[PDB]
Enzyme design. Structure first.
Site, mmCIF file in Angstrom:
data_model
loop_
_atom_site.group_PDB
_atom_site.id
_atom_site.type_symbol
_atom_site.label_atom_id
_atom_site.label_comp_id
_atom_site.label_asym_id
_atom_site.label_seq_id
_atom_site.Cartn_x
_atom_site.Cartn_y
_atom_site.Cartn_z
ATOM 1 N N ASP A 150 47.649 -49.248 59.908
ATOM 2 C CA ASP A 150 48.713 -49.762 60.763
ATOM 3 C C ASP A 150 50.071 -49.204 60.362
ATOM 4 O OD1 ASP A 150 47.049 -51.299 62.405
ATOM 5 O OD2 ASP A 150 47.120 -53.009 61.032
ATOM 6 N N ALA A 166 51.355 -60.279 61.590
ATOM 7 C CA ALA A 166 51.813 -59.674 60.345
ATOM 8 C C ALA A 166 52.760 -60.597 59.588
ATOM 9 C CB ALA A 166 52.493 -58.332 60.624
ATOM 10 N N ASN A 212 55.225 -62.380 60.640
ATOM 11 C CA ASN A 212 55.386 -63.656 61.327
ATOM 12 C C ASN A 212 54.310 -64.647 60.904
ATOM 13 O OD1 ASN A 212 56.168 -65.383 63.971
ATOM 14 N ND2 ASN A 212 53.942 -65.098 63.901
ATOM 15 N N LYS A 213 53.095 -64.156 60.658
ATOM 16 C CA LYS A 213 51.995 -65.043 60.295
ATOM 17 C C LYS A 213 52.180 -65.612 58.895
ATOM 18 C CE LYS A 213 46.927 -65.213 60.232
ATOM 19 N NZ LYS A 213 46.838 -65.775 58.857
HETATM 20 N N1 LIG Z 1 50.916 -55.834 63.602
HETATM 21 C C1 LIG Z 1 50.261 -56.050 62.465
HETATM 22 N N2 LIG Z 1 49.396 -57.068 62.364
HETATM 23 C C2 LIG Z 1 48.740 -57.294 61.236
HETATM 24 N N3 LIG Z 1 48.905 -56.529 60.169
HETATM 25 C C3 LIG Z 1 49.756 -55.495 60.205
HETATM 26 C C4 LIG Z 1 50.464 -55.227 61.368
HETATM 27 N N4 LIG Z 1 51.235 -54.158 61.149
HETATM 28 C C5 LIG Z 1 51.016 -53.774 59.893
HETATM 29 BR BR1 LIG Z 1 51.851 -52.298 59.048
HETATM 30 N N5 LIG Z 1 50.127 -54.578 59.324
HETATM 31 C C6 LIG Z 1 49.630 -54.474 57.945
HETATM 32 C C7 LIG Z 1 50.521 -55.306 57.020
HETATM 33 C C8 LIG Z 1 50.035 -55.230 55.572
HETATM 34 O O1 LIG Z 1 48.698 -55.733 55.491
#
Ligand SMILES: Nc1ncnc2c1nc(Br)n2CCCO
Ligand SMILES: Nc1ncnc2c1nc(Br)n2CCCO
Ligand SMILES: Nc1ncnc2c1nc(Br)n2CCCO
Ligand SMILES: Nc1ncnc2c1nc(Br)n2CCCO
Lengths: 261, 261, 261, 261
Positions: free
Chosen positions: D45, D159, D161-162
């Protein structure tokens, strides 16, 4: 007795400081900011925190007392209108002392640098991600990845520990509380999530995984550390001493600060 | 010594119970479920909770021990393959005992009914809204309005207290933790929100405001109470005693249950 | 137009209801509680909820309006001193209507019973544990074990959804929010923990695992259901209609209720 | 079509990139990293986030697609063994496109600097305390004091936010979510606490109170800003476009990442 008074620096605090000094002048009280036995803080909890770290090398010979010229603090919990009545019983002595636990923070490089905290001690990463291995009593417990961690004192749980979701514990309990700061929990990273309360003689050790630079803070002071090999947390053997002249329960200071006063 | 063994009721637990009884028959051990000195629980934490309440009137003459035929529990933390080695050292004695605090719950009507809890004790409303006045050490602290409240023991913080956001505290700390259950916080109702940890000799008193009927629970048993005048919580003077034959730290049982085993 | 007015039942609400009826008598307004076109609620949000369910079979021919004789509600957001000015523009018509989404709840046994909610709909277990399998759009998502679940409407997020940790969303968003109630998360049970926001046409299906009896609630009414085969949640195609005579933003009603008024 | 491929930089990603280029060479496909119509990201990501910001000035002429050489990401959700089958349908075209909303961040000094975010945008204080006045649609809503704030996109709710307690919302909802970072809530400071979900055309404006320097971040890039007069958040009119060749629901990517895969 030898005494000294610090001030927030504004008019309301400087004027009350001069009035108490003049009130102390009518007694057998000597002003001395080198080896005082009574340290009076006028201002707020932040002013009290500075008075604590100014004399942390003489905690056993000092009884602290705080006066809030603003809103009610947890350490400065005396109204300014009670200053004249404070000067009386401080000279007559025979007052009781209350003791709160403290947090010891040891940092190791590749020597050792130790610190003493009244509220909490936090660890963050300088720029890159924050990933550390949490070790409780020589046993690996979790690999934390997030913003950082916060180890709080009992009386410090009402501050930064409270904003992170931690629990409020009575300052008569000799313990320390560790809380998380925006931890990542997916199928690959797994943290406990719940705050942890450790009794005396328990050692929580933070160890780096990739980056070795951490932004460590102790109460108000925050300084960057480079090439950190370990961070150790444990309840301190030293305690802070207060002077009590009336019953002001901790749970009542919690009520007046968060419910209503 | 006099001993007795309870079972979950299924094959895996009933077969292991009969094997340990036969193993105990080769020693100077007498089976007795009236006045036993060693109570063995085979099943899970729920089976252990039943064994505790079966003999809560003889807590000082009993050393408990639990065996988990399923996943690792916090009270039943012995693998079934270690049962034969348990029978040996239980007959030879000379084992050490560990003690965990307990929670005392007193209910008053318009007499008194007391209870002893190992995990937690919760209070809910039967139908209508739940509104009570929380009083800490004879001082009014807040007016709670929501689903209910939960007062947990140190070893019970890993259960229902944990699901409500409470903190995990080491069972060597003599304290109790109160957490909230979906509290309402607007400009008219104001609760503390944070969990509260009370030391020994602190009394938390719940008092009704409108409805007098409450659905009170102690561990597993839950019974409706009518015309309740007060609910009192405090750390109990009695403790539960375990038998230890190896080092199994509490923080390691927390790791194996929530991180990974 | 045909109108009707409900009251909380006390003096302050009954007197204001009679004054508005007399004020409506000076216009071309007919009182009718069978097929009204303007339903006026005097009391609080609970009184408004009763007025909604009294006429939920005629939602498309009714424009609701609420008056709070106590504190400011989210549905009854008109001060009593504005009642005389309300009677004027209600007779002259030409007012604008605002529409909020609704939640449809379908229950299936072994027929079908459907319900319409303005705030939220919750599911609990009657006595035993609450364990259900959560299925999102025919795909199994998680096996929830805890106290229960809460599916909320956009305008209902400021109520029970808010106390469970859910987020506040603007009522102009056609969606529904699902939150958890004290979920168990160990190495064997795994829930998402975070609240979930579903757009239109998404179907969340709850299915039992062991017990088939559930204590289901829709807004204020709560009734026990036996032998439940499935519980379906989805955004309703019907909406509730309000009458606006001035700009009162949702975020300002949030401020006045939770920050300060 | 014109295409280009980025890589994480390691062997596993560089080898797969060269294989897809050779596979694309057998078709009517031209490599071009200046004006591509198909941007392929190989890595994770984070690698996908870099590919988005490399071509954010041509979002309307580009269809993105991600390949995860490690664990399953939310943007790179294609297994490496499916790369050969991706090259086929990318050349034959006739594929469908999916669009996710974006967040626009405007900063004003004493000119204007705008940014586009795919995940979130956060604001922190550089050294001193973080105190800002939150203004929603020209109306003052609260005075936030704490670590900072986080405005997230729909697809970015999984990400950062969670980890802050925010809710997960389906990326088909055109909205933005604001969450808090360790807010202070006493009798003098009052924040909403709950996350807020704003629809399109809503403007959230952050304004300083004392310090004017803020540490602002957009996705991965984070840069210090000096003498900030205002920070504006709103849902962007531009969207990001993906290429779909199979049904992979958002709620199933949530399950495989947080429940179990
Ligand atoms: N939109 C995303 N949703 C979940 N995870 C994400 C996202 N973008 C990234 Br970069 N990550 C990885 C973060 C470190 O685990
Ligand atoms: N121990 C403390 N408990 C509560 N509040 C505190 C404490 N120490 C300080 Br400094 N503050 C004020 C923080 C900014 O409101
Ligand atoms: N003290 C306890 N700590 C953790 N878990 C427990 C405890 N007691 C019981 Br019963 N359980 C099992 C609850 C259902 O998983
Ligand atoms: N939609 C609602 N938003 C906020 N509050 C509400 C709502 N409905 C009702 Br009833 N209340 C009052 C609950 C007890 O304070």
């Amino acid at each position: 007795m030898k005494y000294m008074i610090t001030s927030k620096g504004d008019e309301k605090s400087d004027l009350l400081r001069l009035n108490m000094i003049a009130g102390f002048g009518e007694y057998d009280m000597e002003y001395d900011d080198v080896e005082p036995e009574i340290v009076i803080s006028i201002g707020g909890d932040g002013t009290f925190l500075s008075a604590f770290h100014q004399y942390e090398e003489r905690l056993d010979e000092i009884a602290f007392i705080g006066i809030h010229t603003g809103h009610l603090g947890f350490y400065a919990d005396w109204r300014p209108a009670e200053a004249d009545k404070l000067v009386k019983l401080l000279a007559k002595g025979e007052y009781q002392k209350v003791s709160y636990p403290l947090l010891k923070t040891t940092v190791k490089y590749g020597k050792e640098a130790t610190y003493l905290a009244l509220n909490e001690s936090t660890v963050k990463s300088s720029g890159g991600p924050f990933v550390v291995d949490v070790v409780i009593n020589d046993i690996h417990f979790e690999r934390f990845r997030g913003d950082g961690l916060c180890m709080s004192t009992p009386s410090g749980t009402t501050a930064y520990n409270k904003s992170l979701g931690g629990a409020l514990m009575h300052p008569s309990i000799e313990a320390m509380q560790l809380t998380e700061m925006a931890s990542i929990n997916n199928r690959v990273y797994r943290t406990i999530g719940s705050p942890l309360v450790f009794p005396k003689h328990h050692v929580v050790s933070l160890q780096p995984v990739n980056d070795k630079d951490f932004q460590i803070s102790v109460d108000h002071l925050s300084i960057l550390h480079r090439d950190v090999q370990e961070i150790r947390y444990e309840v301190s053997a030293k305690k802070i001493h207060f002077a009590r002249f009336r019953s002001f329960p901790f749970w009542r200071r919690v009520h007046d600060s968060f419910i209503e006063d």
